[PDB]
Design a protein around this nucleic acid. Structure first.
Ligand SMILES: Cc1cn([C@H]2C[C@H](O)[C@@H](COP(=O)(O)OP(=O)(O)OP(=O)(O)O)O2)c(=O)[nH]c1=O
Ligand SMILES: [Ca+2]
Lengths: 412, 554
DNA sequence: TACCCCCCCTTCGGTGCTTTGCACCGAAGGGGGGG
């Protein structure tokens, strides 16, 4: 018995029509069981083919969860409600969250089931549950409350949320709290012991307001950027200097001060690649000045909230992965490298999935946005396995790229 | 009227009205069988006479029910479908017999006049308006509106399937141990109950279907194996496709090969090793579907050995959820692959084939991963799990491929099977330059207007070559320059290019290509013992890359 | 002279980067199959 906030799609735009992809047995059983109890609790109710809209659905397990969690892929719906959660009922981002020594993520998605949903908007939350071997046609449902994973859900609940938090935001003034989708990010400069205690205080403070919490521990100050680095060799071959020149030439699109004239002079002849080339005075000095320019920051790189974040990832082999987050090309807001992730030295798709999750988590903390991913994988390969390794309650936008590493610029 | 079951609301596309199109000049032979059953509908309330207050009209025809003397009625609603609201089909796929668990007793029953047993929506009935012809053109014929789902509408299947599910839902919950495979009006009911009790529960369901006005005719009712279900013949412990007739035409048209290819693709689900490559090579770029085209000595051999597999009968088995799933793949050549999915050895659940040629340049390792991915999705559909793979590729072969490739790639749990021909990488680029190997600085360039270009190289040892090229492109000259360095070099060679396009193609280690120039580069790379490819930027005064940039532009 | 679904094989052309050529992909029309 609560007033339903009206929601309308973007002007001149139609609801999501996205087919349901095949699901494994363990995920269909989990979904039917999750959806049965969600129906007897009135959270959802069955519908029919008169509803032209549909959104894919599947299940996951969070890191060490052991309990299944329902997940709907509202990416297409979110792109069509973009007017709502950005212009109107958006949430300000705390630039100080990324400066806290510890940040904790809590799944508050179960609270969205409290508030009902606008009746005129329920037709767009439609999803279909498949059956193994098409024993049964698709069983369709609709959301009566705020759906888990919809971008409008945390904006509507924000008024209710900021009231539940207000007693704790006063009792602990300098602790930063941010809310993104089904997750609540909480960070403090307190010691680890004090930090985890104030989390449990926030858990009980949420319990008496009618919410459970089925925690992820981050450390944004610990995160380290990845810079472009030039090798150190006592003797240089033609191939060494050729590789170096191609790298410096490519890096010149970021740091314009890079010079190659004195290093290109060393190559002027037609020499064997393995021949050793002693460096001249001016070449060693041009190399020295280049190494210092690569220590500097890129001039004029800053975050624009109106622009989308882009994330490129390169597979470096032997378990290493590099990534750069940018808005305009070569104006990189952050660069980094991951190693020894789950599935290293055995599974490429798992590592790439784990990398996407880590990058998105960092983007949420720093800018409160999820970047669009350029994935170095074939579409069929990614679309087959990525759900098996997905452990997050959000799903970023992605596309697939094929860019051979002609020049190893982000890792030696 | 009367209300059998809960109706389904329907609308039109907003701001649009119904179907006003004139009837077809139907022959009186079909009109005889037409008005016969048509007048019988009005007695049961399925159809109704309407006054001229209804200003819509839609054509009507009829075809004979296949394998029957009875006639079925069809309505051309193409224009109504254009202006009817969009649905979301609840039929997500087709059941496969290889997904059926073994059941002690099984019953198959079809519902009679099914779309006619489901009430349409009250307010929408008016838009079904059509007129029935006569023997002559003097009598007008009564105009009718449908009170039930018409065959030919674009919303009829979705509404029937969803209505069917709501009807079976109470029974399914009351009998959780009964397996009901619901596909339109075709019901596969199986159980581990004793056969006496099974028919007792069958009658309860026929009564519950009857309670909601769904007929279960005995003629469509099947009690005895082998059950005819989804074009298969289901036996207690085996299944097979209903027999497949291959056309015996002496002279083939395009529509003949098309019919042949489809029959073979259908057979490939149980008959192992069906190949369609050389038969499909005949249908490329042909204008007329009726055009006559001769059979190549390749397609003649392929159709001959395909008929020999279909000669001896084969069968599949059923699914045992306790035992693992195994999928084994063999290489058939020319980008063709076949596989068998089984649980007990030599007893297949089903077979299949992956022959898709993806991309201009590929290799057997890429195509094998794509076939593994096709099987995984297919297995997740049927059994909801990923099978264990037996692959004809050495463990070290795969380990070298996926670790070095710049894109993420993976294969699920798999083991090596020694069945030849094995999948391999036909060459390997050195990671570091080769000491003692001649170093070839290659380059190429073409004129956009003249289509003329040059491709050549310079070496550290003084060697050189430049070749004029006719009707070529900038990319082709860059590949050509590498071909020259490969031809004119020893077993070990260092090649320095500035072509991003060429280096990307070659570094992916292809063994097949649409481009014949690349095949010659591939052919050369296989012959070499050590190849080291490198990249330098153009116009930077680099190495011989500046000297050969001068030669190929003059 | 109809409807809906799944599969393969081919054509063709939009998309974006390898660039005004070349490579990739998805819709579509051919066929098979089901009701
Ligand atoms: C076979 C077939 C069915 N259908 C639709 C209409 C049917 O109501 C429904 C099932 O068709 P059928 O099962 O073949 O026939 P029926 O259900 O009308 O009853 P009976 O078997 O006693 O003759 O699917 C078509 O539209 N075109 C077709 O070719
Ligand atoms: Ca029937």
């Amino acid at each position: 018995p609560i007033e339903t906030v009206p929601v309308k799609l973007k002007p001149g735009m139609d609801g999501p029509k996205v087919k349901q992809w095949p699901l494994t047995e363990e995920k269909i059983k989990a979904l039917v069981e999750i959806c049965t109890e969600m129906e007897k609790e009135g959270k959802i109710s069955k519908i029919g083919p008169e509803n032209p809209y549909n959104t894919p659905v599947f299940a996951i397990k969070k890191k060490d969860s052991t309990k299944w969690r329902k997940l709907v892929d509202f990416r297409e719906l979110n792109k069509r409600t973009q007017d709502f959660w950005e212009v109107q009922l958006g949430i300000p981002h705390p630039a100080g969250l990324k400066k806290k020594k510890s940040v904790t993520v809590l799944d508050v998605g179960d609270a969205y089931f409290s508030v009902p949903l606008d009746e005129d908007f329920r037709k767009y939350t439609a999803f279909t549950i498949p059956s193994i071997n098409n024993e049964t046609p698709g069983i369709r449902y609709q959301y009566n409350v705020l759906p888990q994973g919809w971008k409008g859900s945390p904006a509507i609940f924000q008024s209710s949320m900021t009231k539940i938090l207000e007693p704790f935001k006063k009792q602990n003034p300098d602790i930063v709290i941010y809310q993104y989708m089904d997750d609540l990010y909480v960070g403090s400069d307190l010691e680890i012991g004090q930090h985890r205690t104030k989390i449990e205080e926030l858990r009980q403070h949420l319990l008496r307001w009618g919410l459970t919490t089925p925690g992820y521990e981050l450390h944004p100050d610990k995160w380290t950027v990845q810079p472009i680095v030039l090798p150190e060799k006592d003797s240089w071959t033609v191939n060494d200097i050729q590789k170096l020149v191609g790298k410096l030439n490519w890096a010149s699109q970021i740091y314009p001060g890079i010079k190659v004239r004195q290093l290109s002079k060393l190559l002027r002849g037609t020499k064997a690649l393995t021949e050793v080339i002693p460096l001249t005075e001016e070449a060693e000095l041009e190399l020295a000045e280049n190494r210092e320019i690569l220590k500097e920051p890129v001039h004029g790189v800053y975050y624009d909230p109106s622009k989308d974040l882009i994330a490129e990832i390169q597979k470096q082999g032997q378990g290493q992965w590099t990534y750069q987050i940018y808005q305009e090309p070569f104006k990189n807001l952050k660069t980094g490298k991951y190693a020894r992730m789950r599935g290293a030295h055995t599974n490429d798709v798992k590592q790439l999935t784990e990398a996407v999750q880590k990058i998105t988590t960092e983007s949420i903390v720093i800018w409160g946005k999820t970047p669009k991913f350029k994935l170095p994988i074939q579409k069929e390969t990614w679309e087959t396995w990525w759900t098996e390794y997905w452990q997050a309650t959000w799903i970023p936008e992605w596309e697939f790229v094929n860019t051979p590493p002609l020049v190893k610029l982000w890792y030696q | 009227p009367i209300s059998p079951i809960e109706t389904v609301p329907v609308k039109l596309k907003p701001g649009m009205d119904g179907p006003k199109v004139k009837q077809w000049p139907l022959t009186e032979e079909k009109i005889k069988a037409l008005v016969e059953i048509c007048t019988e509908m009005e007695k049961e309330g399925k159809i109704s006479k309407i006054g001229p207050e209804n200003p819509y009209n839609t054509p009507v025809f009829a075809i004979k029910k296949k394998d029957s003397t009875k006639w079925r009625k069809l309505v051309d609603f193409r224009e109504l479908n254009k202006r009817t609201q969009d649905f979301w089909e609840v039929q997500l796929g087709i059941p496969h017999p290889a997904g059926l668990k073994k059941k002690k007793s099984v019953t198959v029953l079809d519902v009679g006049d099914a779309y006619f047993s489901v009430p349409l929506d009250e307010d929408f009935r008016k838009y079904t308006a059509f007129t029935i012809p006569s023997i002559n053109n003097e009598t007008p014929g009564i105009r009718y509106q449908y009170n039930v789902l018409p065959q030919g509408w674009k919303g009829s299947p979705a509404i029937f399937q969803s209505s069917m599910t709501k009807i079976l839902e109470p029974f399914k919950k009351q009998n959780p141990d009964i397996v009901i495979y619901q596909y339109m009006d075709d019901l596969y009911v199986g159980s581990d109950l004793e056969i006496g009790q099974h028919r007792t529960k069958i009658e309860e369901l026929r009564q519950h279907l009857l309670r909601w006005g769904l007929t279960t005719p005995d003629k469509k009712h099947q009690k005895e194996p082998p059950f005819l279900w989804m074009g298969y013949e289901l036996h207690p412990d085996k299944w097979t496709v209903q027999p497949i007739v291959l056309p015996e035409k002496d002279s083939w048209t395009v529509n003949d090969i098309q019919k042949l290819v489809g029959k073979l693709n259908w057979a490939s689900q149980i008959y192992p090793g069906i190949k369609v490559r050389q038969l499909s090579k005949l249908l490329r770029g042909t204008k007329a579907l009726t055009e006559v085209i001769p059979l190549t000595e390749e397609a003649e051999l392929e159709l001959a050995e395909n008929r020999e597999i279909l000669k001896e009968p084969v069968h599949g088995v059923y699914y045992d959820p306790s035992k693992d799933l195994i999928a084994e793949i063999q290489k058939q050549g020319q980008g063709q692959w076949t596989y068998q999915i089984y649980q007990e050895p030599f007893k297949n659940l089903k077979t299949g084939k992956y022959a898709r040629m993806r991309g201009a340049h590929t290799n057997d390792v890429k195509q094998l991963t794509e076939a593994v991915q096709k099987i995984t999705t297919e297995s997740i559909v049927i059994w909801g799990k990923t099978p264990k793979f037996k692959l004809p590729i050495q463990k070290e072969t795969w380990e070298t491929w996926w670790t070095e490739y710049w894109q993420a790639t993976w294969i699920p749990e798999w083991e090596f099977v020694n069945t030849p021909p094995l999948v391999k990488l036909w060459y390997q680029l050195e990671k570091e330059p080769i000491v003692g190997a001649e170093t070839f600085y290659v380059d190429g360039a073409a004129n956009r207007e003249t289509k003329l270009g040059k491709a050549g190289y310079v070496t550290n040892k003084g060697r050189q070559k430049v070749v004029p090229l006719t009707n070529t492109t900038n990319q082709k000259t860059e590949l050509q320059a590498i071909y020259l360095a490969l031809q004119d070099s020893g077993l070990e060679v260092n090649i320095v290019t500035n072509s991003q396009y060429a280096l990307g193609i070659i570094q992916a280690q292809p063994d097949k290509s649409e481009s014949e120039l690349v095949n010659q580069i591939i052919e050369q790379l296989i012959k070499k013992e050590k190849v080291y490819l490198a990249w330098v930027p153009a116009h930077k005064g680099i190495g011989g890359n500046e000297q050969v940039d001068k030669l190929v532009s003059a």
